[PDB]
């Protein structure tokens, strides 16, 4: 009769999520649907090699597609054709070269999209696979939502901390009023 | 400064086979405990097995810690801090990425309840109380040793 172990679930890892993401891309071919601990351990040794290939692919894609086509991904409000031929045709029609059109495109980019676009910074070199990962894939890095809801932990960062809540003891009486209430100490009026 | 070594939660790399070894140790401990209730083994035999099977597992995890770091994540921030000899040793790293093992009550005896979790995974309430014996022993013996 199988025994409950608390180790029956494989630990969520960064390697497993990336390895599964690379499996569907075709960059890697795993033995089965789920990456084994041997494959995840092997992934750590060669993790940098696969990241560089994705980075090289993006540089090759940028070289071929062009600045307009490549960076249009982070400008949603840009509906014009971003192809190399379209950009050249637009320059012939209007005289605005590729750089002028490129500045025009980024004029419509929102600040939220710009921060996302910073993953393409030549210094940061963020992983192209990580930039386009869906939320459902990201959660598997730590293994989905916590069983204990975080809403229990959440507290607004402006709270007077009501001391009459269910988790607080009864209000502490003033010491020279609990004694007076229990008639242990007579008031000065009684004394005089 | 330029390289800027820095450790994160996932930098505390654990041996891949820890889950298997701990699960195997639990199965042996559970089967033996069941037969101890049946009367097929006596209390001392259970006591020795509990201490030894968890100590051997802890030592094996410590033994396999460096080759795993060398073969898989040579530039792991936690590995480089200890392997280069800059700060910390294997034992202290083992407390973070392996398992704290068995502590000792202030009489020299071994506490039969092991600490299967490390500091990254976090100790349970009972495991943390047990680990307070080692902390109390360490601080007290430090005063004795220096004086």
């Amino acid at each position: 009769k199988e025994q409950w172990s608390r180790w029956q679930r494989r630990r969520p890892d960064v390697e497993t999520v990336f390895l599964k993401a690379m499996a569907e891309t075709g960059q890697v071919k795993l033995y089965g649907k789920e990456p084994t601990l041997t494959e995840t351990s092997l992934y750590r040794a060669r993790r940098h090699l696969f990241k560089e290939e994705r980075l090289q692919a993006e540089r090759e894609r940028l070289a071929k597609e062009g600045p307009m086509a490549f960076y249009s991904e982070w400008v949603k409000a840009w509906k014009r054709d971003t192809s190399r031929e379209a950009v050249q045709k637009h320059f012939e029609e209007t005289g605005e070269d590729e750089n002028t059109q490129l500045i025009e495109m980024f004029s419509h980019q929102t600040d939220r999209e710009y921060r996302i676009m910073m993953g393409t910074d030549v210094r940061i070199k963020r992983d192209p696979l990580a930039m386009r990962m869906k939320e459902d894939q990201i959660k598997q890095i730590w293994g989905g939502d916590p069983v204990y809801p975080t809403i229990n932990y959440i507290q607004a960062p402006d709270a007077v901390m009501d001391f009459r809540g269910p988790d607080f003891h009864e209000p502490t009486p003033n010491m020279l009023s609990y004694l007076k209430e229990n008639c242990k100490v007579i008031s000065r009026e009684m004394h005089e | 400064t330029a390289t800027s070594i820095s450790l994160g939660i996932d930098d505390l790399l654990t041996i891949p086979s820890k889950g298997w070894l701990v699960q195997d140790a639990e199965q042996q401990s559970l089967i033996l405990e069941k037969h101890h209730h049946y009367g097929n083994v006596h209390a001392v035999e259970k006591l020795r097995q509990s201490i030894e099977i968890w100590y051997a597992t802890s030592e094996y995890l410590r033994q396999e810690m460096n080759p795993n770091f060398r073969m898989t994540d040579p530039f792991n921030p936690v590995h480089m801090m200890s392997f280069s000899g800059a700060r910390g040793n294997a034992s202290q790293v083992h407390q973070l990425v392996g398992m704290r093992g068995l502590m000792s009550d202030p009489q020299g005896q071994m506490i039969d309840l092991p600490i299967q979790s490390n500091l990254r995974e976090g100790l349970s309430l009972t495991e943390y109380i047990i680990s307070c014996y080692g902390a109390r022993k360490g601080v007290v013996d430090t005063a004795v040793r220096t004086s």
């Binding site: 060669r46 090699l49 696969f50 | 280069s84």
Partner: peptide
């Protein structure tokens, strides 16, 4: 000691440097 260790931690070698089995700049000084 960490900084010196990083300096002398040289190139990645073997399978950690190339994805596939092969089957670099020259500096005068």
């Amino acid at each position: 000691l960490i900084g010196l260790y990083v300096l002398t931690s040289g190139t990645r070698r073997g399978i950690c440097a190339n994805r596939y089995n092969p089957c670099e700049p020259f500096f005068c000084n």
